[PDB]
Structure formats: C-alpha cells, structure tokens
Symmetry: C3
Subunit: 168 residues, 3 copies
C-alpha cells in the first residue's frame, strides 16, 4: 500500500502528455556495471503519453546491450503499453518515434527514428500490460558514450523520446 502509493506518485511525477519524454539516468556507473554483470540487464522508464488521454508508452534500455548489440552497445527500445483510454484510440499505433542520447555539450546527439511496422504485434492494441518492445539494438556503442565523452556527465545520462503527433 504505502510502497504502491509511492509508486503511483513517482509515475505521476515523471509523466508527460505531449509525446516528448526526457529520461535522466543517474548512478550511471553503478547501473552500467550491474548490466555488465547481468545482474540488472534492463531498466524500464516511467510511462508517458501522446496527449492527456492518449497512448501510454515507456522505454526499456540495456546499458550493456541486447540482441545484436549485447556486450557492445547501449540498446534502447520503445514500448506501447495498455493505456486507460485505448478503446478511444486508433490501432495499430502508427506514430513516428524519435529516440536520442543527449550530448551534454549539445555538440552531437545520438539519434535514430523509425516508423512503426503496422503489421508487428508491437503496435497492436495492447492485451497485456506491455506490448513487445522494438527499437534500437545498436543505439550507441558502449565506447562512444560510457567511456567518457560528453554523454555521461556527473554520473548521469539523458535519454530523449519524441513521438510525432501527426494525425492525433
């Protein structure tokens, strides 16, 4: 109860309703090692929405990679979740998604973007809490970021997601 209430509070505190989400990941070094050790391979971000009563979404990241990026890259994925208002939304989900690793020197951000494969189960109306994630297995080489550079600063990185709202 108490713990479950704190959770709702944190989720409410991180949520946004305009399709733009910024995820600050503090304690980067520790989490990065917990991933390398396979103790905590992935981390989910809090949920965010395309509009006040729009699609519910979240991100999933592997600090030491997944799939073709395992052990060599930071893998970042987008997840369509079951939203409270899904019955009012058009399905399958078909909004362009842009994902970024922010350069804290704003000189060169890592960026990738994709248009949902309407035939994939990842974008159908959610039956479970979350649909199968999809995104960027090779989002960023562990060396480009992590190592040093300008992506990690004061032991934290910022991930940014932009869900295009065309048609909504």
């Amino acid at each position: 109860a108490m713990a479950d209430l704190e959770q709702k509070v944190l989720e409410m505190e991180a949520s946004t309703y305009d399709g733009v989400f910024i995820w600050k990941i503090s304690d980067f070094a520790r989490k990065r090692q917990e991933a390398v050790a396979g103790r905590i391979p992935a981390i989910f971000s809090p949920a965010f929405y395309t509009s006040r009563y729009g699609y519910k979404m979240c991100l999933r990241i592997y600090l030491n990679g997944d799939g073709t990026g395992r052990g060599t890259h930071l893998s970042l994925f987008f997840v369509v979740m079951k939203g409270p208002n899904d019955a009012l939304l058009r399905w399958p989900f078909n909004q362009k998604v842009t994902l970024m690793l922010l350069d804290q020197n704003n000189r060169e951000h890592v960026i990738d973007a994709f248009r949902p494969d309407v035939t994939s189960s990842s974008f159908q109306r959610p039956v479970n809490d979350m649909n199968i994630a999809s995104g960027c297995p090779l989002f960023c080489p562990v060396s480009k970021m992590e190592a040093k550079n300008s992506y990690v600063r004061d032991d934290a990185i910022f991930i940014k997601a932009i869900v295009d709202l065309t048609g909504l």
Copy 2:
C-alpha cells in the same frame, strides 16, 4: 491520513486544466445495479479546471436517472465547485458547457450543451464545497446505452465534458 493521501493522489491523477475532461467509468454493470438497487444512485467525477488557476468543476451522474429521468434515463449534471482561486475569477460562472456520452465506435456520440442561467444559484461563487448541480436529467435513455449498442464496451463507458473558454 493514508487514505486521505491516496484520495488526493487519485484526484491529481485525473485533473485536467484546459476545460476538457474525459471520465471513464469502469465496472459499468455493477455500478449500474448499485444505482438501480438504490444503494448508490449518484457518482461524482474527479475535479477538472478551465485553466491552471481557473474554475474548479466536476460531474455528477445517475446511472439510473434523476428527476424527470429517474428510472428511464442516464442523468448527467455539471457542478461548479469551490476552487482555490475563486477570488480571482468572475462570477457568476458563465461558460458554455458541452456534455457527451462517447460511442466507442465513434458512430454517433450523445451530445448536449447548455449556457449557464446567470440567475441560478448553481453558478454563483460557491459558499459550500459544491454548488447545486444542473445539467441534463434526460441525457440518454437507459436503453440507448446500457442495453448494448456502442456506448458500453468491455464493461465501461466514457463521459466527456467540454467547457468553452471564451473570455478566459
């Protein structure tokens, strides 16, 4: 206090600040029977506002009717509540209000609208937590909705309120 905190959280989670409110009512059948049985004739929706510091409002619904619609219609009412910034607002409340029962096939929503009766106590600056509710006693026949149709889907209905912001 714990229970009181949960309530505030849930209210904050539902609040909107642009005059548009979508109220999803799950467990329709059960609440519908609680209404027919006379155990819980009415339900208040969480509060929403015309602006970040505007009028505070909520909805009141009778799943089995009230007044001229008792036992035959779904009665939907609008409620002007005592807001924390009422001293900065113009009174009496004078914004056009639109109420809707959403068709979950978007085939044809039930809609009605009204201009507040400036001389009614329902729209004067609140002295109590809530002014006397007013709205639509004959909003929707129990048969048009409930029965089946496209308003009730997966045992839930969606009510939508839109407060016109002209002059604010």
Copy 3:
C-alpha cells in the same frame, strides 16, 4: 516517510511548467504578525518551472520587509533553484522575470520586472539547493496592501510570477 510523501504530493500539486505561477497566501493576518514579530521573517513558495524539463524556481517573500524594505515594505524575491535537468540548460539564467501582487478588485496590481544580471551569483548554475535570492526589497509598502485596500481579501493575498520564455 509519511510526511515526506505528503510533502512530495503537495509540491507536485502546486507546480506549473509554463513559467507562470500564482501563489495564494492564506492566513495572511497570522503570517503577517509572525513576520512582524520576527518569528517567521520569510516564506518560500512551492517550486515551478519554465517548461516540463526547464529551470526550477521559487519565490521568497518577507511580509514585513527585508533589506531596505525591512519593517516598511513587503519584500518579494525570485529564486533560481537546482533543477533535475540543469545539465541540459543554458547558464547563467537569463529570462526576464515579472512579479506582481494581485489586486483582488483587478483595478491596480503591484508590478515590477527585471532582466537578470548575468554577472550575478543569483543566476549562475546552482551548486546548492537554492541560489542567492534576488528581486524587490521595496515591492510594496506595508500600508498600501495589508492595511486594507483590495490586495488582502478574506485573509488572503495572491502573488503572481511570470517568467518570460523568449529563447526557450
């Protein structure tokens, strides 16, 4: 924990993210006297932001004055706080700030505005929870408001802050 969670909830409830904040100060008479008695010289307002992930700011008011306004004026100051996303923001803080004491008769509001002194310690990237406050020592004579007039009504006053978003 319990009180900690309530505090978090109260903060979230008061925050805004568009650079506009309205601060309602109730129990004016009592707090006014506590300031006069030197028991509680100043009060801080809840935090608000320039954007969803922008600068974090709050206000600091002296109901019985501070500095050149001590004992004769209401002193109102602006505070740049350490925000969770300062790494992503440009420093020093350089947005125009407008502060107002609202006339609850909307006939004559007290207003002042300033463009940050970029060389000031008050606008550099925060090292501590709060930077040195800056603002209006002689914002409003204790007599103009307090005494009576239209600023204090039903034992409450409203302070409003508007942070210009040009460049953000």
